[PDB]
Design a protein around this ligand. Structure first.
Ligand SMILES: [Zn+2]
Length: 954
């Protein structure tokens, strides 16, 4: 075969991985991985081009990102602007892409029966894209919103600020997103033909030698091979040299520098950065991760422990951070308490003290050995990935590793390299340090402005006196290396499937205190389990004050277990613990071996909790800011939030919570906890590598612990009250209007309430949503370009449902309203004009999506958990609902549109949330809308309306 340059030897995989693999290099240089999974419901492909933003023309920032957007909008073989989206949508698929500095990564999934058609359309992106003039003029606005959305976001600002403070000559300094100015206005002004620059760029850099492809399907490896050779060997090889960046963006003049930065949110952070060489080639020893593991440790003896005890920091991140081919960074990032903010010099001294400890002890093979063993176990028992993410991830790493090692390369450690460890450790020195402090206290004291985001900051030399103090850091006896991790699992035995084992969770305990749902894993056979618990107390959400206290309690509890639980975390045993409107939620996930130990500790801790006053005051202060910082969330997020407040029976606002927070004292909190625990109901799902007897024991152990230490008594069934959704009146339209003070975009959510969830009402809604899904995106974004964010689909809450539209835009909400209304009328015509085959395609597409099997335990657990917390308990829901779905007709959907959704629908139930921005033809005809009732007060609104029933259990 002349189209294939070489075929891969065995691709190393986990012995638990039933998927089949073959690696190839095509004659044109494309590295390929083929994955055969005859069980998969969705097939997938991805292609990664080893070119990105760092290669943008200096005079056209964002070109490669723009290019990425434009490949979706038509090729020579498939010139219809949305043929790709529409094909994927009509075949249960989805696509996306991303542009980073050195990569452009495209990926899709689709129903397994339609891989070839999806893959063919896809391949044309890399052969002959149209870069249509009309589409270019429109899509540039979507890139502009993407950017607009990021501008007042603290992370993006910091991201670009770093680039702005290094060598300006370095490609690292480039603005990667682009916007209307960089991609249209300035280029027109400078006489540039952007369509030619896209063609020029595609031609020069989209070369086969820089591409890697991954394809996953039901087909055999042989069949997948022919397929890929067929569609991809015509991609042209231009032998483009791979861009490299051997010169660090941070040279001498950029070291021993301090940056004082004003955030948008009220946050307090410190970023310590060291420039380091490119460690990528050392992947078999991974010295930077060895050091990140230690410097970032959260257990006893760690840097974070001492910083916490001193009341200076709460969280810490440490380790290596990617740059590009040629350079990397090493970082230590902490948040700051109000004291911490006054002690940055000391915090940083402690950092250099801990680093000095590492020099003193030298490289530790036992530490390396441990990281190795953990990674080995993690790889062996890796959860089976969803195809779309998997092809994308592997396509990226086909560029860095031999074909035979792509699956293992990022997991298995091979080499102990004390030499490389000392080499990197030698870079972590004060003379090589960069320091950034983010705090509102710098407000008004800054003299520089980063140009792309507007970030206010100040730059100073770190004084030599301060550098010297850091350089002479003695050994602090508070810092000890971590000890052996006792949570490392050793028992991976898969218990044989019991005789009375069930396909769905079975109710195996139904007492006044406990409802225990159980299922032994019959699918995945990895030594793991998920243990989920809902704790109900009417006292977790009875008022704002108690809602605050439930939160602080659990935050305090997690803060207190952190040192102990960290070992468990590294050993693949994690837990999740948060307060809810009904109670408390606890999830323990991971290797089942040491699980009961961690679970017992959490419950013991809950029931015998002693609060540290210093920890209390600090966490309370952070929570204060956290509530306040909601003002800086995105407009569309505000819209969703306000709607959730409006449609739920009981809901405390951020203002209400914040106001009540000043009244939370230590005495009150101490009194609250035993009250909260005094009466409970526990509903649990125990699912995985466990038996009925172990499950009964785990459950009973949780109860017995609560009973012994907290004297927990049962709740009454009548107390187990779920909240209802507000029942909107026939033909009603309500508008609630608010302003976002931070962002200069508007947000809108439109909710067309339909009826109670129900087999029939569920599938009417879901099928209509399926049909309008792609056209809504194509119409409201691609054509009309209202915003980057355009979403439509079902909304489900409290047993009720309806259709929702969410948009974030530069246009005012009342304008968005008419365009969404104009769009609905178009869909009605579209359903009338659509063929029977086209209609059945949509039924078939939704069917595939609903019946898509979970590939890992947690995904299956999640399905059940939904059935359980919604109190609907409909475990066979998918087969049932798909069967009903298949009997539906074009006529049925049209009747449902006319009765519930159309503008003059007799049972239209419409509520709109308008979030105004900070400073506030060729188009289809929008219908005239009625005068809306403007909601002035959320409480009056709820009082004046009925409440829906709750859904009856299955
Ligand atoms: Zn984008």
């Amino acid at each position: 075969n002349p189209a294939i340059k070489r075929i891969g030897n065995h691709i190393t995989k986990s012995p638990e991985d039933k998927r089949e693999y073959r690696g190839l290099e095509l004659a044109n240089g494309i590295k390929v991985l083929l994955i055969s999974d005859p069980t998969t419901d969705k097939s997938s492909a991805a292609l990664d081009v080893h070119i990105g933003s760092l290669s943008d023309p200096p005079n056209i920032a964002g070109l490669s990102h723009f290019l990425q957007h434009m490949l979706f909008l038509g090729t020579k073989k498939y010139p219809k602007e949305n043929e790709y989206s529409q094909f994927l949508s009509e075949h249960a698929g989805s696509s996306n892409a991303f542009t980073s500095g050195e990569h452009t990564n495209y990926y899709f999934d689709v129903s397994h029966e339609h891989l070839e058609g999806a893959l063919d359309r896809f391949a044309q992106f890399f052969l002959s894209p149209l870069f249509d003039e009309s589409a270019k003029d429109r899509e540039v606005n979507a890139v502009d919103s993407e950017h607009e959305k990021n501008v007042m976001n603290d992370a993006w600002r910091l991201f670009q600020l770093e680039k702005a403070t290094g060598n300006p000559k370095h490609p690292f300094s480039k603005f990667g997103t682009g916007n209307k100015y960089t991609l249209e206005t300035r280029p027109n002004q400078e006489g540039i033909d952007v369509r030619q620059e896209l063609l020029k760029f595609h031609s020069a850099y989209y070369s086969s030698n820089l591409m890697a492809v991954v394809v996953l399907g039901r087909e055999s490896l042989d069949d997948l091979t022919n397929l890929v050779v067929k569609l991809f060997s015509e991609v042209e090889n231009k032998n483009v040299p791979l861009p490299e960046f051997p010169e660090h963006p941070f040279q001498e003049e950029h070291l021993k520098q301090l940056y004082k930065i004003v955030p948008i949110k009220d946050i307090r952070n410190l970023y310590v950065t060291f420039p380091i060489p490119d460690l990528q080639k050392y992947y078999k020893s991974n010295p930077g991760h060895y050091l990140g593991h230690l410097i970032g440790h959260e257990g006893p003896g760690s840097l974070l422990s001492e910083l916490k005890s001193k009341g200076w920091v709460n969280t810490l991140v440490g380790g290596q951070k990617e740059g590009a081919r040629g350079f990397m960074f090493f970082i230590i990032n902490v948040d700051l308490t109000e004291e911490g903010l006054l002690h940055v010099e000391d915090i940083i001294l402690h950092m250099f003290q801990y680093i000095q400890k590492l020099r003193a002890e030298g490289p530790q093979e036992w530490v390396f050995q441990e990281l190795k063993d953990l990674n080995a176990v993690a790889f062996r028992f890796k959860d089976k990935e969803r195809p779309r993410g998997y092809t994308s991830k592997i396509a990226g790493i086909l560029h860095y590793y031999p074909l035979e090692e792509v699956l293992t390369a990022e997991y298995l450690l091979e080499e102990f390299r004390p030499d490389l460890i000392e080499m990197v450790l030698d870079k972590l020195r004060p003379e090589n340090v960069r320091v950034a402090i983010v705090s509102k206290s710098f407000e008004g004291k800054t003299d520089r402005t980063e140009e792309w985001y507007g970030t206010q900051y100040k730059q100073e030399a770190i004084p030599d006196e301060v550098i010297k103090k850091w350089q002479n850091a003695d050994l602090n006896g508070k810092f000890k290396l971590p000890t052996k991790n006792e949570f490392i699992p050793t028992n991976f035995e898969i218990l044989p499937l019991e005789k009375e084992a069930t396909p769905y969770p079975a109710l195996i305990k139904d007492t006044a205190m406990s409802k225990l749902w159980f299922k032994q894993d019959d699918k995945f056979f990895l030594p793991k389990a998920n243990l989920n618990f809902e704790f109900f107390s009417p006292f977790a959400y009875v008022d704002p004050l108690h809602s605050n206290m439930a939160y602080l309690y659990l935050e305090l509890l997690k803060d207190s277990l952190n040192e102990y639980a960290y070992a468990a975390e590294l050993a693949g045993l994690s837990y999740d613990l948060q307060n809810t409107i009904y109670g408390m939620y606890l999830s323990v996930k991971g290797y089942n071996d040491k699980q009961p130990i961690l679970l017992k500790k959490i419950i013991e801790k809950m029931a015998t909790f002693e609060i540290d006053e210093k920890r209390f005051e600090i966490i309370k202060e952070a929570y204060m800011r956290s509530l306040n910082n909601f003002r800086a969330e995105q407009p569309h997020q505000h819209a969703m939030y306000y709607l959730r407040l409006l449609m739920t029976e009981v809901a405390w606002t951020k203002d209400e919570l914040k106001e009540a927070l000043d009244d939370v004292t230590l005495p009150r909190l101490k009194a609250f906890i035993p009250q909260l625990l005094s009466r409970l109901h526990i509903e649990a799902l125990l699912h995985g590598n466990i038996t009925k007897q172990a499950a009964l024991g785990i459950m009973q152990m949780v109860e017995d612990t609560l009973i012994e230490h907290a004297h927990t008594k049962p709740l009454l069934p009548s107390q187990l009250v779920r909240y209802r959704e507000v029942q909107l009146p026939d033909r009603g339209w309500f508008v609630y209007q608010q302003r976002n003070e931070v962002h200069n975009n508007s947000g809108i959510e439109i909710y067309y309430q339909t009826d109670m969830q129900s087999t029939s009402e569920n599938m009417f809604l879901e099928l209509f949503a399926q049909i309008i899904s792609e056209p809504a995106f194509n119409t409201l974004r691609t054509k009309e370009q209202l915003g980057y964010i355009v979403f439509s689909g079902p909304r489900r809450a409290n047993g009720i449902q309806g259709l929702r539209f969410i948009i974030q835009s530069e246009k005012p909400p009342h304008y968005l309203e008419s365009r969404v209304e104009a769009f609905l009328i178009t869909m009605e015509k579209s359903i009338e004009d659509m063929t029977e085959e086209a209609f059945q395609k949509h039924i078939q597409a939704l069917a595939i999506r609903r019946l898509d099997k979970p590939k890992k335990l947690s995904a299956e657990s999640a399905k059940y958990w939904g059935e359980i917390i919604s109190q609907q308990y409909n475990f066979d829901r998918d087969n049932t609902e798909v069967a009903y779905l298949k009997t539906l007709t074009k006529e049925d959907i049209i009747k449902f549109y006319k009765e519930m959704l159309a503008v003059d629908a007799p049972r239209r139930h419409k509520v709109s949330v308008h979030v105004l921005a900070r400073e506030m033809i060729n188009l289809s005809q929008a219908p005239a809308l009625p005068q809306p009732e403007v909601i002035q007060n959320m409480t009056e609104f709820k009082r004046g309306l009925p409440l829906f029933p709750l859904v009856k259990p299955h």
